[PDB]
Amino acid sequence: GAKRQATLNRLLFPSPTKEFNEHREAYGDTSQLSANQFFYGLRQGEEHRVKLERGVELLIGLEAISEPDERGMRTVMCILNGQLRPVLVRDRSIA
Amino acid sequence: GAKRQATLNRLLFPSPTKEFNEHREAYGDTSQLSANQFFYGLRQGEEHRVKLERGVELLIGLEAISEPDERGMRTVMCILNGQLRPVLVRDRSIA
Numbered sequence: 001g002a003k004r005q006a007t008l009n010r011l012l013f014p015s016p017t018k019e020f021n022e023h024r025e026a027y028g029d030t031s032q033l034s035a036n037q038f039f040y041g042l043r044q045g046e047e048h049r050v051k052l053e054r055g056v057e058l059l060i061g062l063e064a065i066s067e068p069d070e071r072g073m074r075t076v077m078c079i080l081n082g083q084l085r086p087v088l089v090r091d092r093s094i095a
Numbered sequence: 096g097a098k099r100q101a102t103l104n105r106l107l108f109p110s111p112t113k114e115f116n117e118h119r120e121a122y123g124d125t126s127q128l129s130a131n132q133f134f135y136g137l138r139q140g141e142e143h144r145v146k147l148e149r150g151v152e153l154l155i156g157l158e159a160i161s162e163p164d165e166r167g168m169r170t171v172m173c174i175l176n177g178q179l180r181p182v183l184v185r186d187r188s189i190a
Binding site for chain 2: 044045063064065066067069075077084
């Protein structure tokens with residue numbers, strides 16, 4: 001079962017499987033993304049389709065990005081299923 | 096009355112009063128704005144109060160600006176009375 005598989009994963013490579021478990025807890029399941037979204041990100045004018053389940057698909061796009069405030073925090077306006085969504089993110093470049 | 100004032104304005108300086116009439120038709124009444132808003136515009140992080148009538152005031156702010164598409168058109172996300180508003184504008188710099 002899946003228990004044996006998890007026990008093998010932890011018994012073979014402990015540190016990276018623990019990192020993988022933390023990442024999967026944090027950001028759900030991202031193995032369904034493409035290379036372009038996974039490695040680069042979102043661009044403006046481009047719609048992406050991500051398959052969650054059979055008949056359950058998500059349509060993701062970008063709208064705009066604001067310059068950072070006195071903190072290192074920026075706000076990104078995106079589109080999910082045709083609805084606007086603001087997301088607060090940290091820009092590690094300006095510290 | 097106001098008719099005499101309009102007739103004097105048109106009889107003294109026709110071309111600029113006609114431009115002023117077109118501008119007032121296009122953009123309502125903007126004589127209540129400050130020098131900073133009138134000459135420069137809107138910046139991010141600041142909130143402006145504009146008085147329309149006695150007890151009727153408007154609170155204006157900025158959220159973000161997107162880079163122009165294949166056209167010369169940009170979308171500016173602003174805040175009016177605490178509500179998000181997208182405005183489509185033309186950037187004459189890139190033609």
